[PDB]
Design a protein around this ligand. Structure first.
Ligand SMILES: O=C(O)CNC(=O)C(=O)O
Ligand SMILES: [Mg+2]
Ligand code: NI
Ligand SMILES: [Zn+2]
Length: 331
């Protein structure tokens, strides 16, 4: 088997290899990339997402979220406090303010250390889950707004027609803005392009050891666990790499920089943080290989996780037994 230590692999497609998205995902998985739970894709030097980002200040962040932490440095939950709307311009200015800017540091490793030591003592504001794309419509390759849809994948593989659409989301980040330990909705893939700004650091557990993570999480957040058997779906728990080492949880880390794609694979748990003001775009996608992961995906039936319109149909078709109890959580 390829990639038996489950390392994060980095790919450098040629522009010829960058034409067929589905094919290159399949290629990466033939080299074992999926075993890590995450891969890096460096686009070919010829490729451009768009001409410039000169005009993006006028994008509105309707609901910025202040990420308030509770707990110890390496084991904490965060809750999202809703703030007043602001433009990307206002957000970027806020991200560069003395209160919120990235501190002095030698390298990513020094900054990682400061993040984990000082994360809980601060409340950065995130512009997350904003519907839209910054890909130019004339960008034909790896345009996240022009991928085949999950519904069409489901229909090609299983013969069933369902409602739903699937569109990209933008994420405006600043120093310390954090994404908690999670898999994608329905354990789908995700693809994330870092359009501009400072880096994003990612941690990931191999899908074949996801249950080990889940078990640690139940021990670390014992109340949350009683409340909901898929409480990582709530996207609030943080666990540091030190804590993961101490408890024997296999994992890897990598930093994504501007102009790079990351792909998460079905049931690859991930978490991470932003180094400073940036903007990423992301979307879930599926392959034939996803269908069984979707069949087996854990669901939140405590009602905290509150998920998209399009997820109804996935659960309804792939998880008909779960569908009576799950939709009562969604309503
Ligand atoms: O970019 C973020 O903050 C979170 N991104 C992801 O979890 C993803 O693309 O799967
Ligand atoms: Mg604008
Ligand atoms: Ni994700
Ligand atoms: Zn729940």
């Amino acid at each position: 088997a390829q990639n038996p230590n489950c390392n994060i692999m980095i790919f450098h497609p040629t522009k010829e290899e960058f034409n067929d998205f589905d094919k290159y995902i399949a290629y990466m998985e033939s080299q074992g990339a999926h075993r890590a739970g995450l891969a890096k894709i460096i686009p070919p030097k010829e490729w451009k997402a768009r001409e410039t980002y000169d005009n993006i200040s006028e994008i509105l962040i309707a609901t910025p979220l202040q990420q308030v932490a509770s707990g110890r440095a390496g084991v904490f939950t965060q809750y999202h406090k809703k703030k007043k709307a602001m433009t990307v311009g206002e957000y970027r200015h806020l991200a560069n303010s003395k209160k919120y800017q990235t501190p002095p540091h030698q390298n990513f490793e020094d900054l990682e250390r400061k993040y984990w030591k000082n994360r809980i003592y601060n409340s950065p504001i995130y512009g997350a889950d904003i519907s839209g794309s910054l890909f130019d419509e004339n960008t034909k390759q790896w345009n996240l707004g022009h991928l085949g849809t999950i519904q069409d994948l489901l229909e090609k593989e299983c013969g069933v027609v369902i409602e739903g659409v699937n569109t990209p989301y933008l994420y405006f980040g600043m120093w310390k803005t954090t994404f908690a330990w999670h898999t994608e909705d329905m354990d789908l893939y995700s693809i994330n392009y870092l359009h501009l700004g400072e880096p994003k650091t990612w941690y990931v557990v191999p899908p074949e050891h996801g249950q080990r993570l889940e078990r640690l999480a139940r021990e670390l957040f014992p109340g949350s666990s009683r409340g909901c058997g898929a409480f990582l779906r709530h996207k609030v728990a943080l666990i540091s790499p030190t804590v993961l080492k101490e408890n024997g949880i296999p994992f890897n880390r990598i930093t994504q920089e501007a102009g790079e794609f990351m792909v998460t694979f079905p049931y690859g748990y991930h978490a991470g943080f932003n180094h400073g003001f940036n903007c990423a775009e992301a979307i879930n996608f599926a392959t034939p290989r996803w269908i069984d992961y979707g069949k087996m995906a854990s669901q939140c039936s405590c009602g905290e996780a509150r998920v998209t319109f399009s997820m109804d149909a996935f659960v309804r078709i792939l998880q008909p037994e779960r569908y009576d109890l799950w939709k009562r959580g969604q309503d």
